[model samples]
Target chain A: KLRGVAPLHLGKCNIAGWILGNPECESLSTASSWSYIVETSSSDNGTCYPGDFIDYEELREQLSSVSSFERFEIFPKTSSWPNHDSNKGVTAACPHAGAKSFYKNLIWLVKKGNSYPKLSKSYINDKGKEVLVLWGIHHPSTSADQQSLYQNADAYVFVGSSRYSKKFKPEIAIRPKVRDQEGRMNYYWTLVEPGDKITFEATGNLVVPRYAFAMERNAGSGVNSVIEKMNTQF
Target chain B: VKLQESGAVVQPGGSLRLSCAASGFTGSDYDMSWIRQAPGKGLEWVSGILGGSERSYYRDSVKGRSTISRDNSRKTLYLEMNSLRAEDTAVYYCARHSWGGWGQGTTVTVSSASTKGPSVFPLAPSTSGGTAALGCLVKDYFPEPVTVSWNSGALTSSVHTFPAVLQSSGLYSLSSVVTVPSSSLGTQTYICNVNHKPSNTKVDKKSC
Candidate 1:
């Protein structure tokens, strides 16, 4: 198959940052000794390929406004990867036109009539879908040498906004609902598609050692890629 | 439970290739990927191959540089890097898109180390000799680049060439003979040598 290409419309919207392992660890025992490798420190590595003529320098400068990023951090050189499949649980099962079967996918459920999260942070109009956020990391360094050092992450969080009236009890919930009521809000279910461009930035939640290969998902352009964007709009 | 998938091979020379196999969970349904880790360092994404089909997803920074393919029949994934260099030395492993776990990684060393030529054997001198035949015996012939020459005050018969086909084990049992007249045995000398690539040249010599 031909190599995958990043999209043009998503130009400069992607940005990535990296932190390398300073005192590298060869074994898990030694890795655990380092605080960054522990729980409090969460990092994800995402590979950044180019898209329709989008200048990487332009992307870097634009992402610079949101987080502290280094140009070298976005290349295929940093080794810290993300861990995704490690924590396993079924999301939602949906039939894939291609898979010829139902595979668990991100689900946004609504019980006929319900208010989105924006109307009332804890308010669900009627049968409302609850929002949950889950993510993963893949650190290739501990794995193999033939592979490039990269990370890809998937995150889903419901941004309940649209709502439906309790009057009509429909069989299925509609996508991107737009309505207003105390308990009526939209449900945003996100499943990052199989092929989406990813860039990253580090979170200040924890301290990373000097020159460590640490990274976090900077931005994603996918189905539920806007949870963070919603926070900015609101 | 999360299972790590990996691939490797015992490479003697020439090319290096391997792949990772994942199972137990939904491998094809989800995204499976390849990661590389350097000596005492972190990991990088070499490429990502979509499950179900051999379609690949790669980082723009390195797609042309590295190639990744998969075999659905065997449920195996493959990775290959051409014109390999020493820096490529590192362990390679595969992980499901979520990067939950990794397969047993494989280590590769890319070096140009070859074997040496056979040791030189001397021809014992004969007190009452008519003619003395001195030569070298090597096994598992290499291009037996054997050469015989007479060594004296002013070099005469300066050059002589012989070729030997080497064995897989590189043992060549070939000899280069230099005939010396019995009368000149007390003063005449001869030399034999073998040459090879990326190695110190070997030369053998003896005096009558």
Candidate 2:
């Protein structure tokens, strides 16, 4: 049975929130700030997507409070985010693309030593609105500046596709099979651009949670530094 | 620094896509674009692309880094990037908006398969005197610092042990000099070998 949609976008917001709290920066409370960079444009097709800015203070508070690596969930269901998708029900942004349909959404985690990511799905409000979760590291040719996160740095990569099915699939599809409702995994990896929402969670088991975003360009202090120090102890 | 392209066609009226390797120096590096010359003098600016977008572009069922990723590999890299466009035709050449280095403008036409390139064999210890200079000659190919190596039993060096002289055919002929004294002439043998990637065959010639 399909449950109703949540009243607030907070659940989805939490994905960005968690990453903000444990940001891999010099001053988690200073470097990354809260600013809603753009207006939602109110157009479903337009790329005026807007996300919440990270609050460094609140982020630090949450990081210190969590004692261990806790279960943090990210349900990035763009299917119902205001005017994200025109259809009232689950509809794929790309219908003919033949991409995987994980109900057109997914969440993947980026961990160490994984060349190819595994596909996973998250339930949005138990409404069967499946979202894929993939996590690992990804270094593209272009950055705001040319910077490289070393090969061994710890980070998580997430991919949410609305297309995935329990059947045989080709790795390089002509156009990734993208479908509306069911039987497809919509989690996208190749199509992911620079500005897509990338979230993170720092576990207690992590010696360097701050390394997640702690590039020399953007350094984090306090808990972030603590984690960075812990990572070297071994 | 100006950019130009040269090519060796496999067939007539067939599609050929090759790039000019950049060298020297160029200004306005921001506008490094691909220009084409065909059927005469008109210069066609087919595309002004970048090599940084981390996405792929597909055309006519072929896909690769379109606007970005041209000549973008770190270094010691080649730019025969995949996914050819017919409009990507012409004696294709690449250049920086402003010039700085030497641009390689050799074009390779895509046509029927041809024979394997020139035969590269190791230099053999011939009837030459005790002092023999041995090396290999590659047609239309140049010799870079990292383009040569040598393997003897004890002194194995990664450096280009052989310095080559440019031949008239726009190719290179590299030779290493060795003088064997009367006493050591019958005791040891010296060899010059040329090895590279995209292919692992080595051409060598022994000294008498």
Candidate 3:
């Protein structure tokens, strides 16, 4: 269950407004008290792979119509990692499917003025499938020392989708319809199709938090193989 | 550590009682929860109970229609729902929390009751195109998993059926459409056949 946080009205503020220092949106840039963590390591050698694509603009666009999403672009950096050196490149990434490399990130959302922030919203697609639109607050301070300050953060988003993965396999149990009883009994577990909406909240509904990490193809080769190698990792 | 669920089918407007048995841990120390998945649908949280106190919390969706309780001596958690409907046809499971230590799900379906058939109609052939379409609307069926088939003349055209969706009334409604050549409208006859099995069958014909 996640603790309460204010919901962000990012839907109302445009990227240009926040970037140009509008008082109403100025808090968007200087806001702190939030950070994300990504844990990853290679199959061959457990090399610490930090940094991932925490594209808030992409997330905002996927969830709602945004104006001026093009104005700000920031990729996650390892220096600002809250759990820096603690995970030891172990990659908090879920080790399912063909995804060899993985990472996890924190999700933050702003809530204020009687507006309760929803952790996430689940939308059933046209195919009768559901997708979650998660909520998170942006961490603007990229200074290296910010890592130590945001260590107690309680929430992180895990993106379970992977190209190598198959359809969801049931792992969690849904609540049942019975009442109090007393007896000694043993039970077996069954499976259900996975990827159904599973929510954990303390006070009210919250947006689903999500994060993703990439596999490192080449460190610093003279040739610009970053794009080329990243393609193969997928 | 382990969980098992058991329940029986009930009639619409009746009540359903199901239980989850837990083992390998002290029932009084942990919280047991109930969750369910409708046929071809996603999982829904029903409620949870504290093992020690047998106190429970309900998800808003099922709060009004259901009750969740626990029995410490039996090491079991129970759920009871009233005013059931065909939409309640689902597989229910028990677990420690939202995930982990899950029990095999028990399927619950409504028994014999008002199993209504579908209403079929043929739309006017497209004026400018070569396509002709037929519609079948199956409504007010209990414990569904309904099937619809189409026949044009003596040939059963390969049909495309949409998923059966639950309505607000707890009954089910399904819509299926089949397309053929518009030129065949006046020369051949088209029929929509709906089968809900055991309880009823319906067929509507459209001929030009």
TM-score for all models, in order of appearance? 0.27, 0.26, 0.29
lDDT of 3 at A224: 78
Candidate with top TM-score is 3
Q: Which stretches of candidate 3 lie over 4 Å from their true place?
A: A1-234, B98-100, B113-208
All candidates' lDDT scores? 0.35, 0.31, 0.43
Question: What's the residue-level lDDT of A133 in candidate 2?
Answer: 31
DockQ of every predicted complex: 0.02, 0.02, 0.01
**Candidate 1 per-residue C-alpha lDDT over A1-234 given as tens digits, one digit per residue, 9 for 90 to 100:** 974432221211112211112111112221111111112122231111100222334433332222211211111121221211111211112222343221111111211122111111111111011221111221212212101111212112222233211111111212331121011111111111223222222210101111211112334412578665565431
Q: Mark the 10 consecutive residues where model 1 chain B has the least summed lDDT.
A: B3-12
Candidate 3 docking classification? incorrect
Question: How do these models rank on lDDT, best leading?
Answer: 3, 1, 2
Candidate 2 interface RMSD (Å): 10.9
**What tier of docking accuracy does candidate 1 attain?**
incorrect
Question: Candidate order by DockQ, highest to lowest?
Answer: 2, 1, 3
Tens-digit per-residue lDDT, A5-35, candidate 3: 4333343223322222222332343332122
Per-residue C-alpha lDDT of model 2 across residues A24-129, encoded as one tens digit per residue: 1112122332211212222332211111222434443333312112222233232112112212221233222373211122221223332212322222211112
